[PDB]
Structure formats: structure tokens, C-alpha cells
Design an enzyme around this catalytic site. Structure first.
Site, short mmCIF file in Angstrom:
data_model
loop_
_atom_site.label_atom_id
_atom_site.label_comp_id
_atom_site.label_asym_id
_atom_site.label_seq_id
_atom_site.Cartn_x
_atom_site.Cartn_y
_atom_site.Cartn_z
N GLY A 180 -14.88 -2.05 1.30
CA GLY A 180 -15.73 -1.46 1.72
C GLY A 180 -16.41 -0.12 0.70
O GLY A 180 -17.62 0.10 0.57
N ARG A 236 0.75 -1.17 -0.03
CA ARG A 236 0.11 0.09 0.20
C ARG A 236 0.67 1.18 -0.03
O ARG A 236 0.39 2.36 -0.44
CB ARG A 236 -0.97 -0.08 1.07
N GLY A 269 -12.64 -6.20 -1.66
CA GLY A 269 -12.56 -7.36 -0.66
C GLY A 269 -11.94 -8.51 -0.78
O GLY A 269 -10.62 -8.57 -1.09
N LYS A 313 -23.62 -14.11 3.09
CA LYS A 313 -25.30 -13.83 3.41
C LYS A 313 -25.83 -13.22 2.39
O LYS A 313 -25.34 -12.35 1.58
CB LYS A 313 -25.40 -13.28 4.70
N1 ATP Z 1 -20.31 -22.03 0.16
C1 ATP Z 1 -19.73 -21.27 1.28
N2 ATP Z 1 -20.11 -21.60 2.38
C2 ATP Z 1 -19.72 -20.91 3.60
N3 ATP Z 1 -19.15 -19.97 3.37
C3 ATP Z 1 -18.69 -19.31 2.24
C4 ATP Z 1 -19.05 -20.20 1.03
N4 ATP Z 1 -18.49 -19.31 0.28
C5 ATP Z 1 -17.93 -18.51 0.50
N5 ATP Z 1 -18.14 -18.46 1.79
C6 ATP Z 1 -17.37 -17.12 2.88
O1 ATP Z 1 -17.96 -16.24 2.31
C7 ATP Z 1 -17.15 -15.32 3.15
C8 ATP Z 1 -17.28 -13.67 3.12
O2 ATP Z 1 -18.73 -13.22 3.22
P1 ATP Z 1 -19.07 -11.80 3.12
O3 ATP Z 1 -20.59 -11.80 2.20
O4 ATP Z 1 -19.04 -11.15 4.54
O5 ATP Z 1 -18.19 -11.11 2.11
P2 ATP Z 1 -18.34 -11.20 0.48
O6 ATP Z 1 -19.57 -11.48 0.05
O7 ATP Z 1 -16.99 -12.29 0.06
O8 ATP Z 1 -17.75 -9.75 -0.05
P3 ATP Z 1 -16.21 -9.52 -0.89
O9 ATP Z 1 -15.49 -10.57 -1.54
O10 ATP Z 1 -16.33 -8.02 -1.23
O11 ATP Z 1 -15.26 -9.07 0.88
C9 ATP Z 1 -15.56 -15.55 2.80
O12 ATP Z 1 -14.78 -15.43 3.92
C10 ATP Z 1 -15.83 -17.22 2.65
O13 ATP Z 1 -15.25 -18.03 3.69
#
Ligand code: ATP
Length: 413
Positions: free
Chosen positions: A393, A35, A370, A212
């Protein structure tokens, strides 16, 4: 549409520049100067373009409005910057106050100054925590006194810290100068997200992944008003599948609240003539753990009780490839499996492979700051895709249709 660094005359002017120096650091060591490297083009451009001086302000860690020089000081960053620049930097023990003002009043030509961690002041974020972790609030009157101090430190303001432009903090929306412009990194962040929002090239594919559903409603909806195709992977998928394909999801994650907006989302998909694609087969684990037994399942068979879906499978990867290969613009936000663990990262990696292939073939590819931006790091594709957001973010809010204060604070023309 906002003013940029290379369109301002920095001849004989002091530059207060807000930059990203929040580097992983244990014991004042800095375990990744990445960074810091990143901000050099903007700083260099200022010196090379006649800047009298360049004052750098930033933050590092979670001091939450309490000076904590012992673990969140920027000092280790200040001399790490000297190394990288082959030029000495003047570190100030604070970011505001009389001393800080004189030191930056009229510096010698070409001097580079770095202020102490901005978040050592509750006025920066506008909120904080005292000696017992309890939330405290900045006084709107002291906040403006803090901002009046920061403004004096320069004649031109440059924001090259996209990662905190979604938060209206002092350094972000409070510097009152005639010209407030975007740095080289910021400018790039905007240039690309502007593409994926103002008038996108088509076919425009949006790949949205994550755990989620409830916290992706805005992102999902805003993307449905622009894209041609959309893939939804990650834990989210199981919520949609259980609700649309009566699939036994076993013990996989399920967003109960988000499950009630599904039908609302599918409607949006339809009025906008878009067809969401979800997995069709899955890689499973007998438990949410890196070294769990790995099994397989399909929409028809569903996941066994106890087991849970952690990554999409062979047929899902194939379908994904087909659709990725026919796009001119791809925006990828969120891996589609638990990438942190190789046993369940295959789907995400395969997708990366395909996306990188699309860049070579003329497709503009944009990645979220992210979990997706780190995937490019883990597999060195940071230079094989069109753009890797430097801020999770902020990129999320931008892609959600929300206003980014730090950006609207920049000057126009
Ligand atoms: N099939 C899955 N089952 C359970 N957890 C999962 C699965 N696929 C991905 N994940 C989890 O999703 C987590 C991130 O969830 P969250 O929605 O908070 O971030 P995101 O959607 O990945 O957003 P970003 O990639 O921009 O940070 C990852 O740490 C990963 O472990």
C-alpha cells in the site's frame, strides 16, 4: 531529507517506536516471524546506543477499533521477540491509559516494552466498526487524548513502519515529541524510492503489472514523467491491446472504465518520449483456474472465446529480457501473469531471473511491496535485488506521487 535513527542521540532517553508486527498468525501461533526479525536492527541500535528503554507499538489483523485480545493480541509476538532477542519483553495489556503511562514513565535501563494492538482503539485509525460490522467514527477529541497519551510514553519517537505511513493514523502522525525519526527499514524504503523519483539513473525502466487499469492511472502517469522505457503486463494489457491493436481478447479481463483513459495515457507516453511495450503473445486458460487447459495465442490471432490470457509468452519474455538488460534503474510493481499458479507464472519468473541478473550487473532494482514482494519470497530473491518494499500500500502511493503522511510527520533539520 528526514531525520534518521542513527542521527539522533538516544543516550538516556525513552524511545517510542512504531513498528511492523502484523504477522500472519492463526490461533496465536505466528506462521512467519519474518516481520519481527526485521525490526530488530532498529531496536538493537537503541539499546546499544544508550536508550533508557524502547517502547514498541504496532497492530495485527483487523480488529477495527474493538479490543479483541483473543485473536489479534500482540502477546504471542511479544514473547516471540524475547526468543529472537534472547532478552525478556514486558507486554502491556493496552496501548494507552494510566497503567501504560506508569509502566513506561521511567523503566529500568534497557527494558523493552510492547503495547497491546493499537487498532483495539478506534482512535488509532480514526475509524472503525462496532459489534455489527457497521462503520463508526472516532471522536476528534478522543483521538487527540489518545495521541497525548502515546506521546508521554517516550522522549524520542521512531517510525520504522513504512507499511502504514500512507495512512495518517495516530501512531503515524500523532506522536508529539521534539524528534520524530525514521527507523532502519523505513529509512531504506525512503532511500531507494527517493532514487526512483528525485533524480533517477538512466536508462530507467518501469515494469508495471496487474489486473485492472483504472486503479493504476496515477502510478502509470507519474512513472511516465520519469522513465525511459515502460512495460505493462498482467490483466491490464488486454485493455490496452483491445483498444490499441483491435485485438480479440476473448474472455480475458477488460477494464471498461480504464479503457477510456488509454488514449490519454498513450498521449502522456508520447509527450514524454516514452514507448510502452506490451506482450506480443500469450499463455491462455480455458478458465480462470490453476489447473485449466493451457493454450497459446498472439496479438494477431487473439484469444479464443471463453479462453483468457493469463501470462505473457515466449516472444514477450524475449523482448522483456532485451529491455531489462539495458537499464540502470528498474522499478517493478506487479507481476505480469497469474504468478500464484505455475502454469502461468513463467513470464513473471523469467522477468525475475532477468532483474536479478541486472542487479549483479550494477542495475539498481526496486520492487513493490505487494504481489511483487512476495514473488521474491516464493523464489528466494529477496537478497538478489537491490530492494524489496516491506509495504505494498505505501510503496504504491509513494510511486504514485502522493504524499505519505507518516513521512511528512517525521522531523527535518
Ligand atoms: N493475465 C492475467 N489475467 C488475469 N489476472 C491476472 C493476470 N495477470 C495478473 N493477474 C492478477 O493480478 C492480480 C493483482 O491485481 P491488482 O492490480 O489488484 O494488484 P497488482 O497490480 O498486482 O499490484 P501489486 O503487485 O503491487 O500488489 C494478481 O492476483 C493476479 O492474479
Amino acid at each position: 531529507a528526514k531525520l534518521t535513527l542513527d542521527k539522533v542521540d538516544l543516550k538516556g532517553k525513552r524511545v517510542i517506536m512504531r513498528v511492523d508486527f502484523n504477522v500472519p498468525m492463526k490461533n496465536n501461533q505466528i506462521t512467519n516471524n519474518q516481520r519481527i526479525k526485521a525490526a530488530i536492527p532498529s531496536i538493537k541500535h537503541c539499546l546499544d546506543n544508550g536508550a533508557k528503554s524502547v517502547v514498541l507499538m504496532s497492530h495485527l489483523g483487523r480488529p477495527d477499533g474493538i479490543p479483541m485480545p483473543d485473536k489479534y493480541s500482540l502477546e504471542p509476538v511479544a514473547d516471540e521477540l524475547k526468543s529472537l532477542l534472547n532478552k525478556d519483553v514486558i507486554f502491556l495489556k493496552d496501548c494507552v491509559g494510566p497503567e501504560v503511562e506508569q509502566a513506561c514513565a521511567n523503566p529500568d535501563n534497557g527494558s523493552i516494552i510492547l503495547l497491546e494492538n493499537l487498532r483495539f482503539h478506534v482512535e488509532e485509525e480514526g475509524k472503525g466498526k462496532d459489534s455489527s460490522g457497521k462503520k463508526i467514527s472516532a471522536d476528534p477529541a478522543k483521538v487527540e487524548a489518545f495521541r497525548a497519551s502515546l506521546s508521554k510514553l517516550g522522549d524520542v519517537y521512531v517510525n520504522d513502519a513504512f507499511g502504514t505511513a500512507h495512512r495518517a493514523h495516530s501512531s503515524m502522525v500523532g506522536v508529539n515529541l521534539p524528534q520524530k525519526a525514521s527507523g532502519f527499514l523505513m529509512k531504506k524504503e525512503l532511500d531507494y524510492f527517493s532514487k526512483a523519483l528525485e533524480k533517477p539513473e538512466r536508462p530507467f525502466l518501469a515494469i508495471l503489472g496487474g489486473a485492472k487499469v483504472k486503479d493504476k492511472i496515477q502510478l502509470i502517469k507519474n512513472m511516465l514523467d520519469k522513465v525511459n522505457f515502460m512495460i505493462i503486463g498482467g490483466g491490464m494489457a488486454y485493455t490496452f491491446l483491445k483498444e490499441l491493436k483491435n485485438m480479440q481478447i476473448g474472455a480475458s479481463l477488460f477494464d471498461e472504465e480504464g479503457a477510456t483513459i488509454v488514449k490519454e495515457i498513450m498521449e502522456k507516453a508520447e509527450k514524454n518520449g516514452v514507448k510502452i511495450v506490451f506482450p506480443v503473445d500469450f499463455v491462455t486458460g480455458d478458465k480462470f483456474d490453476e489447473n485449466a487447459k493451457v493454450g497459446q495465442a498472439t496479438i494477431e490471432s487473439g484469444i479464443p472465446s471463453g479462453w483468457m490470457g493469463l501470462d505473457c509468452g515466449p516472444e514477450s519474455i524475449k523482448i522483456n529480457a532485451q529491455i531489462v538488460a539495458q537499464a540502470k534503474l528498474i522499478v517493478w510493481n506487479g507481476p505480469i501473469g497469474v504468478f500464484e499458479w505455475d502454469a502461468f507464472a513463467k513470464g513473471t519468473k523469467a522477468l525475475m531471473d532477468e532483474v536479478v541478473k541486472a542487479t549483479s550487473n550494477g542495475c539498481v532494482t526496486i520492487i513493490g511491496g505487494g504481489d511483487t514482494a512476495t514473488c521474491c519470497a516464493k523464489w528466494g530473491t529477496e537478497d538478489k535485488v537491490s530492494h524489496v518494499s516491506t509495504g505494498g500500500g505505501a510503496s504504491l502511493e509513494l510511486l504514485e506521487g502522493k504524499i505519505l503522511p507518516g513521512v511528512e510527520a517525521l522531523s527535518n533539520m
